[PDB]
Amino acid sequence: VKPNYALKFTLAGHTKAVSSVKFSPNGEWLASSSADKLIKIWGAYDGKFEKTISGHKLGISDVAWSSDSNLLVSASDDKTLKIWDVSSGKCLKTLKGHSNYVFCCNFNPQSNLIVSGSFDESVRIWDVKTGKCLKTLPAHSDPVSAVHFNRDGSLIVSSSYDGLCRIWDTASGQCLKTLIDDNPPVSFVKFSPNGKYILAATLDNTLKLWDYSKGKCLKTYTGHKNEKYCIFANFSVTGGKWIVSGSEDNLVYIWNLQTKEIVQKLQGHTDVVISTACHPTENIIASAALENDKTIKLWKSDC
Amino acid sequence: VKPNYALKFTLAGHTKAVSSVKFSPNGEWLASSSADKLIKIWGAYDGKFEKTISGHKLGISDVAWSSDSNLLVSASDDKTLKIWDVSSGKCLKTLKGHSNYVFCCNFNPQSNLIVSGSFDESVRIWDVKTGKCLKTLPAHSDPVSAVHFNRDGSLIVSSSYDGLCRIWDTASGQCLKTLIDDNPPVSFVKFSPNGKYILAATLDNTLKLWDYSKGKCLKTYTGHKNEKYCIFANFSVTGGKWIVSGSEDNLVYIWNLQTKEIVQKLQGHTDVVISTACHPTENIIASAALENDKTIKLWKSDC
Amino acid sequence: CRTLPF
Amino acid sequence: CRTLPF
C-alpha cells in the first residue's frame, strides 16, 4: 500500500512563520499558531479562512483543542498560556506561572487539565475551569520541547533538549520512567492512539517508535532532515497506518509504520515544514512552514 | 445545589433499539449494545465512533467491562455470553449453558469472574480465562433482571420479575439475604460504590435505596415512569451526589440522593431511555433509547 | 430481551 | 521560539 496525498488548498494569512497546526477533534476546523502572535481558524475540508484570534503579546509556539472542540489553549513567548472560546474568540483565562517562554501544550482527553512545557525547564499541570496551576514538575534540565497526555489522561510524556524523555503520573506528578547522556536532543514526543507506543524525534534526523511498557525501540524512521527545529510528527490511522512528519528540507515525509520505508514525500513548501497534523476521520494532512513560506497546506488522499 | 447537564454529542449508528451503555473503567470509552446484535465503541469525550463488534446471532441486552478496560462481555438472546478483546474486536470465548436468553452481566473487580442472569431464572458465575461455568445459582422464580458484584467481588446482588433482590456470597454461591412490604417486579439493582447500599427499581415507577446490612429502605425516588422496561439506574458520585435513571417518558431523570428531589430532567430522546451510565471521573452522563430513537446521548455538567 | 415490554 | 533554530 502507498497513499496518494495531493495538494488541495494553500492557506495564506500569517505574517510570520507558522509554528503549529491542529485539527479540531470534531474534524471541522484547523487551528494554526504563529510567531506573528496570532491564532487563525480555517475550515478543515475547504480551507476557508474563518477567524483570527489575538491577545498574546509575543509569538505563539503551540496550540491545542479541548476534546469537545469548543476550547483552544496556546503556548506563547510572553510566558503565559491562554484558553480561548473558539466561537467568540474571547480569551477565557490567562495561565501565568512559567518563568520563561511556553513552548508546548495539550489538554488531557477529559479536557479538565492542561499540560504545558517551557524553556524554564518545568512541566506544569493547570486546571481548565479556574486557570490555577495545580502542579509544577521539575521535569528537565533544559527547554522542554513537547508534552502529551495518553489516551485515558493518566500519563504525561515529556521531552527536552536535555536529552531525556520522561513519563509522568498525572495524578501524583511522579516520574514513572525515563527513556534515555548527550541524547541528540529530544525534540518531539507523543503517545500512539492506543497508548502503548511513544513516537520520539531526536535532533539527529531520526524518528523512533518506542514500546513504552518495555522501554525498547521498535522502529526507526529516517530519510528526512531534522537537526535544528522541534518538528511535530503524527500517527495517521484513518487509512493506511503511517508516520507523518515535517522536515527541514521543505518536504512532508510519510513512512509505512510497519516497514519504516518512505511511502510518499509531499512537495510544495518553500521553507522548513515545522508542523504536520492528521485529520481525525478523513485522510487529510495539514502542513505548515517557516519564515520563507508562512503558509498552511492541506493534502488529501484516497487511502 | 443542582446539576446543569447539557447535551454534547448524539451518537447514531445502531439500526435497532439500544439496550445498554457503559463507560470503561479508565474513562476513555463508551460501549453500547443493541437489539441489532452489535456492540459499538465510542470515544467518551469527543463522541467519535471507534469500531463495531459483531458475532452474536440475536439481540444483546447488556454489556460490561473488565476492570483493566481491555475486555467486554455481552449477554444475548442467542442464550450465550461472549468475551471480547476490545483492541482486536475478536470473540475470545463463548459462554454456553443458559437455557433461555441472557439478560444481564458484569465482571467482578478482580475481573477473573463474570456473573450473568437469564430468563431461564438462574444466575451463573463464569471463569473469564477458560470460559467455563463455575456455578449455577437457582436464584429466582422468574427472569433475572440484573446482577452486580460489590466493591470487592465478595457479594453478588440479583433481582427478578419475581419481586425479590437476593444477595449471594460469591465464593459459595449461597444466599445471604433476601430483601422483601410488597413484591412488584424488580427491574434493576446495583450496589453503591462503597458497597454499603443497594439501589433497586421496581416496575411501579419507583427506585429505592436499601441499607444492605439492616435490610431497610432508606429513600424512595419517584416521578419518573417505569412500568414496562428494565431501565438502568446509577449512583453519580463525581460531582454532586445524585441518582440517575432512564424513564419511559423519554427523559433522563436526576435526583438529589439525600432530599429525593428531582433536580434535573434531560430532554432529547424520542423514545424510552432504557439505559444511563455515569462517567467514573467526569460529570458526564451517557443515555440511550429504544427503537424509535436508536441513539446515544453524551451529556456534561459543571457539577 | 431488554428492548421488549412487560 | 519553536520557529528559531538550534
> CA nearest A272: which of A236, A246, A243?
A246
Nearest to A101 among D1, D5, D6 (CB): D1
State residue B286 phi and psi, 5-degree precision.
-105, 135
d(CA B52, CA B32): 10
Nearest to B19 among C3, C5, C6 (CB): C3
**Contact residues on chain C for B290, CB-CB shorter than 8 A:** 3
B103 in the Ramachandran plot: left (φ > 0), alpha (ψ -120 to 50) or beta?
alpha
| Contact criterion met (CB < 8 Å) for D1 and A20 | no
Give the number of other Cβ atoms within 10 Å of residue B13's Cβ.
16
d(CA B167, CA C1): 23
At residue A20, the 3 state secondary structure works out as strand
- Smallest CA–CA distance, residue A102 to chain D, in Å, is 9
C-alpha distances in angstroms, B266 versus B38, B42, B247?
26, 21, 11
C-alpha distances in angstroms, A261 versus A216, A244, A250?
20, 12, 19
| Contact criterion met (CB < 8 Å) for A61 and D2 | yes
End-to-end CA, chain D? 10
Contacts for A92 with CB less than 8 Å, ≥ 6 apart: A71, A83, A84, A85
d(CA A240, CA A172): 37
A 220-259: CB under 8 A from B: none
Instruction: Annotate A75-112 with b (16+ C-beta within 10 A) or e (fewer).
Output: bbbbbbbbbbebeeeebebebebbeebbbbbbbbbbbb
Residue with cell 447488556: B62
d(CA B121, CA B193): 27
Residue A139, C-alpha cell as written in the block: 521535569
DSSP assignments along chain B, one per residue: -----EEEEEE---SS-EEEEEE-TTSSEEEEEETTSEEEEEETTT--EEEEEE--SS-EEEEEE-TTSSEEEEEETTS-EEEEETTT--EEEEE---SS-EEEEEE-TTSSEEEEEETTS-EEEEETTT--EEEEE---SS-EEEEEE-TTSSEEEEEETTS-EEEEETTT--EEEEE----PPEEEEEE-TTSSEEEEEETTTEEEEEETTTTEEEEEE-SS--SSS---EEEE-SSS-EEEE--TTS-EEEEETTT--EEEEE---SS-EEEEEE-SSSSEEEEEE-TTT--EEEEE---
Cα A211 to chain center, whole Å?
20
> CA nearest B106: which of B152, B64, B54?
B64
Which residue(s) pair with A298 in the sheet? Answer: A9, A286
Experimental technique = X-ray
State residue A296 phi and psi, 5-degree precision.
-105, 135
Which residue(s) pair with A121 in the sheet? Answer: none
**Contact residues on chain C for B230, CB-CB shorter than 8 A:** 2
Contact (Cβ atoms closer than 8 angstroms) between residue B112 and residue B127: yes
d(CA B288, CA B35): 12
| Contact criterion met (CB < 8 Å) for B48 and A280 | yes
Residue type, B276: T
d(CA B227, CA B203): 4
DSSP state of A77: T
Contacts for B301 with CB less than 8 Å, ≥ 6 apart: B3, B4, B5, B6, B239, B283, B284, B285
> CA nearest A30: which of A19, A15, A20?
A20
Helix, strand, coil tally for chain C in percent (to 5):
0, 0, 100
Contact (Cβ atoms closer than 8 angstroms) between residue B82 and residue B76: yes
| Contact criterion met (CB < 8 Å) for C1 and B17 | no
Write B36-40 long-range contacts (CB < 8 A, 24+). B37/B76, B38/B14, B39/B63, B39/B72, B39/B74, B39/B84, B40/B11, B40/B13, B40/B14
Angle at A119 (CA atoms; ends A117, A121), nearest 5 degrees: 70
Is B213 within 8 Å of chain A by CB?
Answer: no
